[PDB]
Amino acid sequence: MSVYPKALRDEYIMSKTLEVKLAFERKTCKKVAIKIISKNVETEIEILKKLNHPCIIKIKNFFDAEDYYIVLELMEGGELFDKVVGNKRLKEATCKLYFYQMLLAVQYLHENGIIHRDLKPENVLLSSQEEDCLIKITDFGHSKILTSLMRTLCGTPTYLAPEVLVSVGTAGYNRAVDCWSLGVILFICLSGYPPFSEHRTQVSLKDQITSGKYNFIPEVWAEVSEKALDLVKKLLVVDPKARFTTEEALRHPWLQDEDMKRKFQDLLSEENESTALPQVL
Amino acid sequence: MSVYPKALRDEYIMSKTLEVKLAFERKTCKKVAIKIISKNVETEIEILKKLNHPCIIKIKNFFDAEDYYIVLELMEGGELFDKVVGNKRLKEATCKLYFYQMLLAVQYLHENGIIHRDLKPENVLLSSQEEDCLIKITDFGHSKILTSLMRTLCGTPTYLAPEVLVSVGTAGYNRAVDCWSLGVILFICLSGYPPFSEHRTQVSLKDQITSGKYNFIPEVWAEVSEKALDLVKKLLVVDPKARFTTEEALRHPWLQDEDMKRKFQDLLSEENESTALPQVL
Ligand SMILES: CC(C)(C)NC(=O)Nc1ccc2nccnc2c1
Ligand SMILES: CC(C)(C)NC(=O)Nc1ccc2nccnc2c1
Numbered sequence A, B: 001m002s003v004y005p006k007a008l009r010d011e012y013i014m015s016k017t018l019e020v021k022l023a024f025e026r027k028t029c030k031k032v033a034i035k036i037i038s039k040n041v042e043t044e045i046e047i048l049k050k051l052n053h054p055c056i057i058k059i060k061n062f063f064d065a066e067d068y069y070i071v072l073e074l075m076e077g078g079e080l081f082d083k084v085v086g087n088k089r090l091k092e093a094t095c096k097l098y099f100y101q102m103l104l105a106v107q108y109l110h111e112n113g114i115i116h117r118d119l120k121p122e123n124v125l126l127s128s129q130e131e132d133c134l135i136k137i138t139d140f141g142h143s144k145i146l147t148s149l150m151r152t153l154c155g156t157p158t159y160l161a162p163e164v165l166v167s168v169g170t171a172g173y174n175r176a177v178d179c180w181s182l183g184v185i186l187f188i189c190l191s192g193y194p195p196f197s198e199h200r201t202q203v204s205l206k207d208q209i210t211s212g213k214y215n216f217i218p219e220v221w222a223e224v225s226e227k228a229l230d231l232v233k234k235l236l237v238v239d240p241k242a243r244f245t246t247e248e249a250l251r252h253p254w255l256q257d258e259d260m261k262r263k264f265q266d267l268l269s270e271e272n273e274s275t276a277l278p279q280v281l
Helices: A006-011 A041-050 A092-111 A148-152 A162-167 A176-191 A205-211 A226-235 A246-251 A258-272 B006-011 B041-050 B092-111 B148-152 B162-167 B176-191 B205-211 B226-235 B246-251 B258-272
Strands: A012-017 A020-025 A030-038 A059-064 A067-073 A124-126 A135-137 B012-017 B020-025 B030-038 B059-064 B067-073 B124-126 B135-137
Touching: A006 A012, A006 A059, A012 A030, A041 A059, A041 A067, A092 A124, A092 A135, A092 A176, A092 A226, A092 A246, A092 A258, A148 A162, A162 B176, A162 B205, A176 A226, A176 A246, A176 B162, A205 B162, A226 A246, B006 B012, B006 B059, B012 B030, B041 B059, B041 B067, B092 B124, B092 B135, B092 B176, B092 B226, B092 B246, B092 B258, B148 B162, B176 B226, B176 B246, B226 B246
Parallel strands: none
Antiparallel strands: A012 A020, A020 A030, A030 A067, A059 A067, A124 A135, B012 B020, B020 B030, B030 B067, B059 B067, B124 B135
16 A cells, blocks of 8 residues: 655654545644645645635645645534535525635735635635634645736837737736636525536536626525625626725625624634733733 | 956956956867856756757856856857847848748747747847858847646636636747747848837837837838748737747748758858767768
8 A cells, every 4th residue: 555754653643534634743632634745835835834814724734755745724614615515505694704704815815915726615624513613715736926027018118029018908917816716606605506507508618607697596596685696796707807806895795794703703712712822911 | 346256267267348248268268258147047047058059049157156157159240239220231131041040049949848038139149240140049038938727727617717718719829929029120130120119100119019000111121022021021910829930930932042041051060060070971
């Protein structure tokens, strides 16, 4: 078969699956999660070590051996995917609590010059087996760091190709891809079904996305509020320059909910209670 | 003032300007050129060391000290810019001989997955103070190496933003920017004047380039053949997918000249005569 590197084994006791395995830190006897990647990962480590937000996964340790071993904080609730798979749907209030945190996490990323590029329910982890819990964004493998165009625009464009001058119009809107993904994640969570699919349709998946013509099933959406649907509509905008940003989404009436914001602050206080050092009064 | 690093001084005797300075290799008593860059350059060195073409500049040595020192083969003819500056124009046959070599050099680059991105007469060097000479492409500082889109297209685009799917149409045509630049270089060489400028015009430089409406002065161009002008027209095409490639330019009637091709092969044989090792018959 295979063995774990001596350096990992020195600090951790490996266990069962959820490539992700459960492990125990020898020093603390505390549960951790170990992500095994087959031998970009160094950039992901550099990105993760620099970011500090409660809704972004923290790297605890790293091992560069026959494979890459990434030690992360364990998330007992698992993937958001498991909560939405096979037409399963979350109650509106739960969608809000989770989405609000996805918005704060993605806003933090953009503020810090990072675009995730791979936001999906599979990359959103829940902190507990309870409905009201803290969420954390994971899988920064496809992430990009925010140029060649700015340097080119400093000189006289005597020899500069027209497509380069044309691209100046859209430049610096790559982050809007994360807002599209969040739009799709919100649609799935609220309805239990994807907005764009090849199930019972003649239109190609490419054509549904470029046209922005999402599959709307009234019977399913009648159960969901008009405010939630309005936010979805504003994130699922084809023009990335017109699409809602994380700030615009956070200002939307749907998230102007003092109850949901309180429940989140409560989950924060409960998580932070373990780490809390006494303070100067 | 300042001093040169001990390691450089150990191997070279520095001299007059043409930041580029003349130097003498101590071992050979041969003239070299030393490019001084103020403390990307490592990528340019990596690019230059890997490429082997008679129309691309060769790096002879490199020094990473208080500044970057790049030892290159000396080009006694200097810049092509000096031959075209202030309405000065080359005789058609000379434009052909030089352009043919720029096409071979740029074709070699594209074949090898490199885009120069900064082709101008200032970055084209002539090997001798004679009209018929070998040319060499220099200044690979802005060059790019040929993706994230291909990796994204492997998965299901359920969460994939429409602008990404839209970009699939143009993807892999960045090299066409080099063909635009060559188009502009050919226009300047043949006419002595730039195709796009802010001299005696109301239309903005950005607007002239995006529209592809080059300044055509009949009196100047009457002296130039219709074949040369046809090639310019085919390189100065706004749509990068329609624009002529180096291969298409090389197949153009204007370059189907057995005399010019012979003169180039002759200059090659003359340069190669010094290095020529005896061979197996
Ligand atoms: C809830 C259950 C079924 C035990 N799964 C789970 O905790 N999965 C994961 C998966 C990936 C993880 N990656 C990092 C941290 N926790 C993780 C937990
Ligand atoms: C002809 C004259 C006036 C003596 N200039 C010249 O050789 N200039 C240059 C400039 C940059 C160079 N870079 C590399 C190699 N030769 C170079 C020669």
